[PDB]
Symmetry: none
Subunit: 150 residues, 2 copies
């Protein structure tokens, strides 16, 4: 899951870089935010395809699960909040590797594995192995969320 | 193309710094050298992503062309040691100013424009204008290589 880890990390870097220049407006949907990021070339290493519902490109992980970058409740008075990167249908092993890896990278402001929100951004292999659920045949059943800025 | 130039020069100084700091190891691939640079914070502000073949982080220029920082090698007739920075799909316009600008203040040991290797690290706009091939619609067709150490 090394490639995957790097994709999420650079995607996050690229997004943080893009948002440093935005002012006066915010994204209200993950769809728009993800399509824009894709347009800007912030997700080259990942699978890019068509949604579509209004000509918006979608992002997909190595397993065919959707990856969505979305604003973390846009608004709040002052600096503009953060964003989250959610990746779906992640297989058991990958879940453990990616979650703990993202924890070590130290770049997030929180890491979620299914209904478990590690707001301290600390996820150990012991925790991940338990929280990451079993695959259904060849299909992953985990949803991971990486929180940034806010 | 001025932002590209500053990017190139900063990436050059950071790589020199990184290589000087290595003691006992050596890079044998551009994939690894570029990844390490990126991890070291040398590419902030530039579009990055992850490489599926190695899990290493990749670098891109502003036109979507890949940038690759690789160590020098040994072909059996020469030992140009050090490293090179290769940027692809560079538009004609930028090709001339970037190449000229690196000749002016890049501290290189050579500048290559497509199949033209200016080993004296001197490139004039007249030369670049001829060597830099025209775009295909919006797509640049130039490959620039900056050599360091020589």
């Amino acid at each position: 899951a090394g490639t995957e880890l790097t994709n999420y990390q650079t995607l996050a870097t690229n997004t943080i870089g893009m948002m440093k220049g935005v002012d006066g407006y915010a994204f209200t949907s993950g769809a728009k935010m993800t399509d824009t990021l894709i347009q800007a070339g912030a997700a080259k290493g990942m699978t890019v395809s068509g949604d579509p519902a209004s000509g918006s490109a979608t992002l997909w992980n190595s397993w065919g699960g959707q990856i969505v970058v979305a604003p973390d409740t846009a608004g709040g008075t002052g600096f503009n909040n953060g964003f989250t990167i959610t990746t779906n249908k992640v297989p058991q092993s990958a879940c453990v590797s990616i979650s703990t890896g993202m924890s070590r990278s130290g770049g997030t402001s929180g890491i979620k594995i299914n209904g478990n929100n590690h707001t301290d951004a600390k996820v150990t292999a012991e925790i991940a192995s338990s929280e990451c659920t079993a695959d259904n045949g060849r299909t992953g059943t985990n949803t991971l969320v990486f929180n940034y800025n806010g």
